[PDB]
Coordinates of N, CA and C in Angstrom, one line a residue:
Chain A
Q9 N 15.3 -158.5 -55.4 CA 15.2 -157.0 -55.5 C 16.4 -156.5 -56.3
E10 N 16.7 -155.2 -56.0 CA 17.6 -154.5 -56.9 C 18.4 -153.5 -56.1
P11 N 19.7 -153.5 -56.5 CA 20.6 -152.5 -55.8 C 20.1 -151.0 -55.8
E12 N 20.6 -150.3 -54.9 CA 20.5 -148.8 -54.8 C 21.6 -148.2 -55.7
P13 N 21.3 -147.0 -56.2 CA 22.2 -146.3 -57.1 C 23.5 -146.1 -56.3
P14 N 24.6 -145.9 -57.1 CA 25.9 -145.6 -56.4 C 25.9 -144.1 -56.0
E15 N 26.6 -143.8 -55.0 CA 26.8 -142.3 -54.6 C 27.8 -141.7 -55.7
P16 N 27.5 -140.5 -56.0 CA 28.4 -139.8 -57.0 C 29.9 -140.0 -56.6
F17 N 30.7 -140.2 -57.5 CA 32.1 -140.4 -57.3 C 33.0 -139.7 -58.3
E18 N 34.1 -139.1 -57.9 CA 35.0 -138.5 -58.8 C 35.5 -139.5 -59.8
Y19 N 35.7 -139.1 -61.0 CA 36.2 -140.0 -62.1 C 37.7 -139.6 -62.4
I20 N 38.6 -140.5 -62.2 CA 40.0 -140.2 -62.4 C 40.7 -141.3 -63.2
Chain B
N3 N 14.8 -160.1 -82.6 CA 16.3 -160.2 -82.9 C 17.0 -160.7 -81.7
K4 N 17.5 -161.9 -81.6 CA 18.1 -162.5 -80.5 C 19.2 -161.5 -79.9
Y5 N 19.4 -161.6 -78.6 CA 20.5 -160.9 -78.0 C 21.7 -161.8 -77.8
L6 N 22.9 -161.2 -77.7 CA 24.1 -162.0 -77.5 C 24.6 -161.9 -76.1
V7 N 24.3 -160.9 -75.4 CA 24.5 -160.8 -73.9 C 23.7 -159.7 -73.4
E8 N 23.1 -159.9 -72.2 CA 22.2 -158.9 -71.6 C 22.4 -159.0 -70.1
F9 N 22.2 -157.8 -69.5 CA 22.3 -157.8 -68.0 C 21.8 -156.4 -67.5
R10 N 21.1 -156.5 -66.4 CA 20.6 -155.3 -65.8 C 21.7 -154.3 -65.4
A11 N 21.6 -153.1 -65.9 CA 22.5 -152.0 -65.5 C 21.7 -150.7 -65.6
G12 N 22.2 -149.7 -64.9 CA 21.7 -148.3 -65.0 C 22.8 -147.5 -65.6
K13 N 22.5 -146.2 -65.8 CA 23.4 -145.3 -66.4 C 23.9 -144.2 -65.4
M14 N 24.9 -143.5 -65.7 CA 25.5 -142.5 -64.9 C 26.0 -141.4 -65.8
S15 N 26.2 -140.2 -65.1 CA 26.6 -139.0 -65.8 C 27.9 -138.6 -65.4
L16 N 28.8 -138.1 -66.3 CA 30.2 -137.6 -66.0 C 30.2 -136.1 -66.1
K17 N 30.0 -135.5 -65.0 CA 30.1 -134.0 -65.0 C 31.5 -133.6 -64.6
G18 N 32.2 -132.9 -65.4 CA 33.6 -132.5 -65.1 C 34.5 -133.7 -64.8
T19 N 34.8 -133.9 -63.6 CA 35.4 -135.1 -63.0 C 34.5 -136.0 -62.4
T20 N 33.2 -135.7 -62.3 CA 32.3 -136.3 -61.3 C 31.2 -137.1 -62.0
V21 N 31.2 -138.5 -61.7 CA 30.3 -139.3 -62.4 C 29.0 -139.5 -61.5
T22 N 28.0 -139.0 -61.9 CA 26.7 -139.0 -61.3 C 25.8 -140.1 -61.9
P23 N 25.0 -140.8 -61.1 CA 24.2 -142.0 -61.7 C 22.8 -141.6 -62.1
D24 N 22.1 -142.5 -62.7 CA 20.8 -142.5 -63.1 C 20.0 -143.5 -62.4
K25 N 18.7 -143.3 -62.1 CA 18.0 -144.2 -61.2 C 17.2 -145.2 -61.9
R26 N 17.0 -145.2 -63.2 CA 16.1 -146.1 -63.8 C 16.6 -147.5 -63.9
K27 N 15.6 -148.5 -63.9 CA 15.9 -149.9 -64.1 C 16.2 -150.1 -65.6
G28 N 17.5 -150.0 -66.0 CA 17.9 -150.2 -67.3 C 18.4 -151.6 -67.6
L29 N 18.8 -151.9 -68.9 CA 19.4 -153.1 -69.3 C 20.5 -152.8 -70.4
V30 N 21.6 -153.5 -70.2 CA 22.6 -153.4 -71.3 C 22.6 -154.7 -72.1
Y31 N 22.9 -154.6 -73.3 CA 23.0 -155.8 -74.2 C 23.7 -155.5 -75.5
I32 N 24.0 -156.6 -76.2 CA 24.7 -156.6 -77.4 C 23.8 -157.4 -78.4
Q33 N 23.6 -156.8 -79.6 CA 22.7 -157.4 -80.6 C 23.3 -157.3 -82.0
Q34 N 23.3 -158.4 -82.7 CA 23.8 -158.4 -84.1 C 22.6 -158.2 -85.1
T35 N 22.8 -157.2 -86.0 CA 21.7 -157.0 -86.9 C 21.9 -157.7 -88.2
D36 N 21.0 -157.7 -89.1 CA 21.0 -158.6 -90.3 C 22.1 -158.2 -91.2
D37 N 22.7 -157.1 -91.2 CA 23.9 -156.8 -91.9 C 25.1 -157.0 -91.1
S38 N 25.0 -157.7 -90.0 CA 26.1 -158.3 -89.2 C 26.7 -157.3 -88.2
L39 N 26.4 -156.0 -88.3 CA 27.0 -155.0 -87.4 C 26.7 -155.4 -86.0
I40 N 27.6 -155.0 -85.1 CA 27.5 -155.3 -83.6 C 27.1 -154.0 -83.0
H41 N 25.9 -154.0 -82.3 CA 25.4 -152.9 -81.6 C 25.6 -153.1 -80.1
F42 N 25.9 -152.0 -79.3 CA 25.9 -152.0 -77.9 C 24.8 -151.0 -77.5
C43 N 23.8 -151.6 -76.9 CA 22.6 -150.8 -76.6 C 22.3 -150.9 -75.1
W44 N 21.5 -149.9 -74.7 CA 20.9 -149.8 -73.3 C 19.5 -149.3 -73.4
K45 N 18.6 -150.1 -72.8 CA 17.2 -149.7 -72.9 C 16.5 -149.7 -71.5
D46 N 15.4 -148.9 -71.4 CA 14.7 -148.7 -70.2 C 13.8 -149.9 -69.9
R47 N 14.2 -150.7 -68.9 CA 13.4 -151.8 -68.5 C 11.9 -151.4 -68.2
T48 N 11.8 -150.2 -67.7 CA 10.5 -149.7 -67.4 C 9.7 -149.4 -68.7
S49 N 10.0 -148.3 -69.4 CA 9.3 -148.1 -70.7 C 9.7 -149.0 -71.7
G50 N 10.8 -149.6 -71.7 CA 11.3 -150.5 -72.8 C 12.0 -149.6 -73.9
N51 N 12.1 -148.3 -73.8 CA 12.7 -147.5 -74.8 C 14.2 -147.8 -74.8
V52 N 14.7 -148.0 -76.0 CA 16.2 -148.1 -76.2 C 16.8 -146.7 -76.4
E53 N 17.4 -146.3 -75.4 CA 18.0 -144.9 -75.4 C 19.3 -144.9 -76.1
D54 N 20.1 -146.0 -76.1 CA 21.4 -146.0 -76.7 C 21.6 -147.3 -77.6
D55 N 22.2 -147.0 -78.8 CA 22.4 -148.0 -79.7 C 23.6 -147.5 -80.6
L56 N 24.8 -148.1 -80.3 CA 26.1 -147.8 -80.9 C 26.5 -149.0 -81.7
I57 N 27.1 -148.7 -82.9 CA 27.7 -149.7 -83.8 C 29.2 -149.7 -83.5
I58 N 29.7 -150.9 -83.0 CA 31.0 -151.0 -82.4 C 31.8 -152.0 -83.2
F59 N 33.1 -151.6 -83.5 CA 34.0 -152.4 -84.3 C 35.2 -152.8 -83.4
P60 N 35.9 -153.8 -83.7 CA 37.0 -154.2 -82.9 C 38.0 -153.0 -82.7
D61 N 38.4 -152.8 -81.5 CA 39.3 -151.8 -81.0 C 38.6 -150.4 -80.8
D62 N 37.3 -150.4 -81.0 CA 36.6 -149.1 -80.7 C 36.6 -148.9 -79.2
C63 N 36.4 -149.9 -78.4 CA 36.0 -149.7 -77.0 C 36.7 -150.7 -76.1
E64 N 36.6 -150.4 -74.8 CA 36.8 -151.3 -73.7 C 35.6 -151.1 -72.8
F65 N 35.2 -152.3 -72.2 CA 34.2 -152.3 -71.1 C 34.9 -152.7 -69.8
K66 N 35.0 -151.8 -68.9 CA 35.9 -152.0 -67.7 C 35.2 -151.7 -66.5
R67 N 35.6 -152.3 -65.4 CA 35.3 -152.1 -64.0 C 35.9 -150.7 -63.6
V68 N 35.1 -150.0 -62.8 CA 35.5 -148.6 -62.4 C 36.0 -148.7 -60.9
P69 N 37.2 -148.5 -60.6 CA 37.7 -148.7 -59.2 C 37.3 -147.6 -58.2
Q70 N 37.0 -146.4 -58.7 CA 36.7 -145.3 -57.9 C 35.3 -145.4 -57.2
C71 N 34.5 -146.4 -57.6 CA 33.2 -146.5 -57.1 C 33.1 -147.7 -56.1
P72 N 33.2 -147.5 -54.7 CA 33.0 -148.6 -53.8 C 31.6 -149.0 -53.6
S73 N 30.7 -148.0 -53.5 CA 29.3 -148.3 -53.2 C 28.5 -148.9 -54.3
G74 N 29.0 -149.0 -55.5 CA 28.3 -149.6 -56.7 C 29.2 -150.4 -57.5
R75 N 28.7 -151.2 -58.4 CA 29.4 -152.0 -59.4 C 29.4 -151.3 -60.7
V76 N 30.2 -150.1 -60.7 CA 30.2 -149.3 -61.8 C 31.2 -149.7 -62.9
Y77 N 30.8 -149.8 -64.1 CA 31.5 -150.1 -65.3 C 31.5 -149.0 -66.3
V78 N 32.5 -148.9 -67.2 CA 32.7 -147.8 -68.1 C 32.9 -148.4 -69.5
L79 N 32.1 -148.1 -70.5 CA 32.3 -148.3 -71.9 C 33.1 -147.1 -72.4
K80 N 34.4 -147.4 -72.7 CA 35.3 -146.3 -73.0 C 35.8 -146.4 -74.4
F81 N 36.2 -145.3 -75.0 CA 36.5 -145.2 -76.5 C 37.9 -144.7 -76.6
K82 N 38.7 -145.3 -77.5 CA 40.0 -144.8 -77.9 C 39.9 -143.7 -78.8
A83 N 38.8 -143.4 -79.5 CA 38.6 -142.3 -80.4 C 38.6 -141.0 -79.7
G84 N 38.4 -140.9 -78.3 CA 38.4 -139.7 -77.6 C 38.0 -139.9 -76.1
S85 N 37.3 -138.9 -75.6 CA 36.8 -138.8 -74.2 C 35.4 -139.3 -74.1
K86 N 34.9 -140.1 -75.0 CA 33.6 -140.7 -74.8 C 33.6 -141.8 -73.8
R87 N 33.3 -141.5 -72.6 CA 33.1 -142.5 -71.5 C 31.7 -142.7 -71.3
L88 N 31.3 -143.9 -71.1 CA 29.8 -144.2 -70.9 C 29.7 -145.1 -69.6
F89 N 29.1 -144.6 -68.6 CA 29.1 -145.2 -67.3 C 27.8 -146.0 -67.0
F90 N 27.9 -147.1 -66.3 CA 26.8 -148.0 -66.1 C 27.1 -148.6 -64.7
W91 N 26.1 -148.7 -63.8 CA 26.2 -149.4 -62.5 C 25.4 -150.6 -62.5
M92 N 25.9 -151.8 -62.2 CA 25.2 -153.1 -62.3 C 24.0 -153.0 -61.4
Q93 N 22.9 -153.4 -62.0 CA 21.6 -153.6 -61.3 C 21.2 -155.0 -61.1
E94 N 22.0 -155.9 -61.4 CA 21.8 -157.3 -61.1 C 21.7 -157.6 -59.6
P95 N 20.9 -158.5 -59.2 CA 20.8 -158.9 -57.8 C 22.1 -159.4 -57.2
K96 N 22.6 -160.4 -57.9 CA 23.8 -161.2 -57.4 C 25.0 -160.7 -58.2
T97 N 26.1 -160.4 -57.6 CA 27.3 -159.9 -58.2 C 28.1 -161.1 -58.9
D98 N 27.6 -162.3 -58.8 CA 28.3 -163.5 -59.2 C 28.7 -163.4 -60.6
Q99 N 28.0 -162.7 -61.5 CA 28.2 -162.7 -62.9 C 28.7 -161.4 -63.4
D100 N 28.9 -160.4 -62.6 CA 29.5 -159.1 -63.1 C 30.7 -159.3 -63.9
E101 N 31.6 -160.1 -63.5 CA 32.8 -160.2 -64.3 C 32.7 -161.1 -65.5
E102 N 31.8 -162.1 -65.6 CA 31.6 -162.8 -66.8 C 30.9 -161.8 -67.8
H103 N 30.0 -161.0 -67.4 CA 29.4 -160.1 -68.3 C 30.4 -159.1 -68.9
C104 N 31.2 -158.6 -68.0 CA 32.3 -157.7 -68.5 C 33.1 -158.3 -69.5
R105 N 33.5 -159.6 -69.3 CA 34.3 -160.3 -70.3 C 33.6 -160.5 -71.6
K106 N 32.4 -161.0 -71.5 CA 31.7 -161.3 -72.8 C 31.3 -160.0 -73.5
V107 N 31.2 -158.9 -72.9 CA 31.0 -157.6 -73.6 C 32.2 -157.4 -74.5
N108 N 33.4 -157.1 -73.9 CA 34.6 -157.0 -74.5 C 34.8 -158.0 -75.6
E109 N 34.4 -159.3 -75.3 CA 34.6 -160.3 -76.3 C 33.8 -160.1 -77.6
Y110 N 32.5 -159.8 -77.5 CA 31.7 -159.6 -78.7 C 32.0 -158.3 -79.3
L111 N 32.4 -157.3 -78.6 CA 32.8 -156.0 -79.2 C 34.0 -156.2 -80.1
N112 N 35.0 -156.9 -79.6 CA 36.3 -157.0 -80.2 C 36.5 -158.3 -80.9
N113 N 35.7 -159.3 -80.7 CA 35.8 -160.6 -81.4 C 34.4 -161.0 -81.9
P114 N 33.9 -160.3 -82.9 CA 32.5 -160.5 -83.4 C 32.5 -161.7 -84.5
Chain C
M1 N 42.0 -130.5 -92.5 CA 42.8 -131.3 -91.5 C 42.8 -132.7 -92.2
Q2 N 43.6 -133.5 -91.6 CA 43.9 -134.9 -92.1 C 43.1 -135.9 -91.3
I3 N 42.4 -136.7 -92.0 CA 41.6 -137.8 -91.4 C 41.7 -139.0 -92.3
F4 N 41.4 -140.2 -91.7 CA 41.5 -141.5 -92.5 C 40.1 -142.2 -92.4
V5 N 39.8 -142.9 -93.5 CA 38.6 -143.8 -93.7 C 39.2 -145.1 -93.9
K6 N 38.9 -146.1 -93.0 CA 39.3 -147.5 -93.2 C 38.1 -148.3 -93.4
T7 N 38.1 -149.3 -94.3 CA 37.0 -150.2 -94.6 C 37.3 -151.5 -93.8
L8 N 36.3 -152.4 -93.9 CA 36.5 -153.7 -93.1 C 37.5 -154.5 -93.8
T9 N 37.5 -154.6 -95.2 CA 38.5 -155.4 -95.9 C 39.9 -154.8 -95.6
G10 N 40.0 -153.6 -95.1 CA 41.3 -153.1 -94.7 C 41.8 -152.0 -95.5
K11 N 41.2 -151.6 -96.6 CA 41.7 -150.6 -97.5 C 41.5 -149.2 -96.8
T12 N 42.6 -148.5 -96.7 CA 42.6 -147.2 -96.1 C 42.9 -146.1 -97.1
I13 N 42.2 -144.9 -96.8 CA 42.4 -143.8 -97.6 C 42.5 -142.5 -96.7
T14 N 43.2 -141.6 -97.2 CA 43.5 -140.3 -96.5 C 42.8 -139.2 -97.2
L15 N 42.1 -138.4 -96.3 CA 41.3 -137.3 -96.8 C 41.7 -136.0 -96.2
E16 N 41.5 -134.9 -96.9 CA 41.8 -133.6 -96.3 C 40.4 -132.9 -96.2
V17 N 40.1 -132.4 -95.0 CA 38.7 -132.0 -94.7 C 38.7 -131.0 -93.7
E18 N 37.6 -130.2 -93.5 CA 37.3 -129.2 -92.5 C 36.2 -129.8 -91.5
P19 N 36.2 -129.3 -90.3 CA 35.1 -129.7 -89.4 C 33.8 -129.3 -89.9
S20 N 33.7 -128.2 -90.6 CA 32.5 -127.7 -91.2 C 31.9 -128.6 -92.2
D21 N 32.7 -129.4 -92.8 CA 32.2 -130.3 -93.9 C 31.1 -131.2 -93.5
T22 N 30.2 -131.4 -94.4 CA 29.0 -132.3 -94.1 C 29.3 -133.7 -94.5
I23 N 28.6 -134.7 -93.9 CA 28.9 -136.1 -94.2 C 28.8 -136.4 -95.7
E24 N 27.8 -135.7 -96.3 CA 27.7 -135.9 -97.8 C 28.9 -135.4 -98.5
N25 N 29.4 -134.2 -98.0 CA 30.7 -133.7 -98.6 C 31.9 -134.7 -98.3
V26 N 31.8 -135.6 -97.4 CA 32.8 -136.6 -97.1 C 32.6 -137.7 -98.0
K27 N 31.4 -138.2 -98.2 CA 31.2 -139.3 -99.1 C 31.4 -139.0 -100.5
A28 N 31.3 -137.7 -100.9 CA 31.7 -137.3 -102.2 C 33.2 -137.4 -102.4
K29 N 34.0 -137.0 -101.3 CA 35.4 -137.2 -101.4 C 35.9 -138.6 -101.5
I30 N 35.2 -139.5 -100.8 CA 35.4 -140.9 -100.8 C 35.2 -141.5 -102.2
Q31 N 34.0 -141.0 -102.8 CA 33.7 -141.5 -104.2 C 34.8 -141.1 -105.2
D32 N 35.2 -139.8 -105.1 CA 36.2 -139.3 -106.0 C 37.5 -140.2 -106.0
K33 N 37.7 -140.8 -104.8 CA 38.9 -141.7 -104.6 C 38.7 -143.1 -105.0
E34 N 37.6 -143.7 -104.5 CA 37.4 -145.1 -104.7 C 36.3 -145.5 -105.7
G35 N 35.5 -144.5 -106.1 CA 34.4 -144.8 -107.1 C 33.2 -145.4 -106.5
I36 N 32.9 -145.2 -105.2 CA 31.8 -145.9 -104.5 C 30.7 -144.8 -104.4
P37 N 29.5 -145.1 -105.0 CA 28.4 -144.2 -104.8 C 28.2 -144.0 -103.3
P38 N 27.9 -142.7 -102.9 CA 27.6 -142.4 -101.5 C 26.5 -143.2 -100.9
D39 N 25.4 -143.4 -101.8 CA 24.3 -144.2 -101.3 C 24.6 -145.6 -100.8
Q40 N 25.8 -146.0 -101.2 CA 26.3 -147.3 -100.7 C 27.3 -147.1 -99.5
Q41 N 27.5 -145.9 -99.1 CA 28.5 -145.6 -98.0 C 27.8 -145.5 -96.7
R42 N 28.3 -146.1 -95.7 CA 28.0 -145.9 -94.3 C 29.2 -145.5 -93.6
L43 N 29.2 -144.4 -92.9 CA 30.4 -143.9 -92.1 C 30.0 -144.0 -90.6
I44 N 30.8 -144.6 -89.8 CA 30.5 -144.7 -88.4 C 31.7 -144.3 -87.6
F45 N 31.5 -143.6 -86.5 CA 32.5 -143.0 -85.7 C 32.1 -143.0 -84.3
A46 N 32.9 -143.6 -83.4 CA 32.6 -143.6 -81.9 C 31.1 -144.2 -81.7
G47 N 30.8 -145.2 -82.5 CA 29.5 -145.9 -82.4 C 28.4 -145.2 -82.9
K48 N 28.5 -144.0 -83.4 CA 27.4 -143.2 -84.1 C 27.6 -143.2 -85.6
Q49 N 26.5 -143.6 -86.3 CA 26.4 -143.5 -87.7 C 26.3 -142.1 -88.1
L50 N 27.2 -141.6 -89.0 CA 27.2 -140.2 -89.4 C 26.1 -140.0 -90.4
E51 N 25.3 -139.0 -90.2 CA 24.1 -138.8 -91.0 C 24.4 -137.7 -92.0
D52 N 23.8 -137.9 -93.2 CA 23.9 -136.9 -94.2 C 23.2 -135.6 -93.7
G53 N 23.8 -134.5 -93.9 CA 23.2 -133.3 -93.4 C 23.9 -132.7 -92.1
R54 N 24.4 -133.6 -91.3 CA 25.2 -133.2 -90.2 C 26.6 -133.0 -90.6
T55 N 27.4 -132.3 -89.8 CA 28.8 -132.0 -90.1 C 29.8 -132.8 -89.3
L56 N 31.0 -132.8 -89.6 CA 32.0 -133.5 -88.9 C 32.2 -133.0 -87.4
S57 N 31.9 -131.7 -87.2 CA 32.0 -131.2 -85.9 C 30.9 -131.7 -85.0
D58 N 29.6 -131.7 -85.5 CA 28.5 -132.3 -84.9 C 28.9 -133.5 -84.1
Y59 N 29.7 -134.4 -84.7 CA 30.3 -135.5 -84.0 C 31.6 -135.3 -83.3
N60 N 32.0 -134.0 -83.3 CA 33.3 -133.6 -82.8 C 34.4 -134.5 -83.2
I61 N 34.5 -134.7 -84.5 CA 35.6 -135.5 -85.1 C 36.8 -134.6 -85.4
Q62 N 37.9 -135.0 -84.9 CA 39.1 -134.1 -84.9 C 40.2 -134.7 -85.8
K63 N 41.3 -134.0 -86.0 CA 42.3 -134.4 -86.9 C 42.9 -135.7 -86.5
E64 N 43.3 -136.5 -87.5 CA 43.9 -137.8 -87.4 C 42.8 -138.8 -87.0
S65 N 41.5 -138.5 -87.1 CA 40.5 -139.5 -86.8 C 40.3 -140.5 -87.9
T66 N 40.0 -141.7 -87.5 CA 39.7 -142.8 -88.5 C 38.2 -143.0 -88.5
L67 N 37.5 -142.8 -89.6 CA 36.1 -143.1 -89.8 C 36.0 -144.6 -90.3
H68 N 35.1 -145.3 -89.7 CA 34.8 -146.7 -90.2 C 33.8 -146.5 -91.5
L69 N 34.2 -147.0 -92.6 CA 33.5 -147.0 -93.8 C 33.0 -148.4 -94.1
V70 N 31.7 -148.6 -93.9 CA 31.0 -149.9 -94.2 C 30.1 -149.7 -95.5
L71 N 30.1 -150.7 -96.3 CA 29.3 -150.7 -97.5 C 28.1 -151.4 -97.3
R72 N 27.0 -151.0 -98.1 CA 25.7 -151.5 -97.9 C 25.3 -152.6 -98.7

C-alpha cells in the first residue's frame, strides 16, 4: 500500500 | 528513454512559511536526454502526465531531507539561485531506500 | 543590472540588462559579444529553459544572476 500525506508543517 | 533514478513521491505547497502537501500518487525521477542534459522531473502515476521537468546543472540544487516534518518523509529540491524550494513526500512503501534515493539524486544532479 | 552567462566549457561573459528585456534581447547581446547565432543559444535558469518572447522578470531573474548558456 501507500503512505498517507504529511500534515501541513511550517517551513523554517 | 531510460531513467537514471525513480521513486514514488508526492508534491507539497509552500504557502508563506507553511508547506502544504498534494495527494496524488506521483513519481520523481531523473532522465538524460539525447543532448545529454540532466532533467529532474515529477509525473502523475495516475494520469501519467509529467508536470515537472527541470534541466539541472552541477551546483544548481540540493535534494535534502526536511526535518520539520515528523509525520512524513518530506524532501526538498532547493536552489542556490533563489527561493525556489520544491517539496516532495516519499510515497514508497518501505523507508529502506529513502536515503539511497536522496544520495543518488544529488549525485546525478551534481555528478552527471 | 548586472548578470552573467556561463557556458559549459567555462567561458563567462558579463551583460548589462533590464528585467523588462526579452530572452531574444538577451541572446542578441550574447551574439554581439561571442558571435553565436541566437538560434544556437539555449539559456536555462533555475531549471527552466528561458523562452523567446518571455522576459527576464517572467522568470524573476535578479541582479548578479548566472544564466546557463548551452549550445545546440
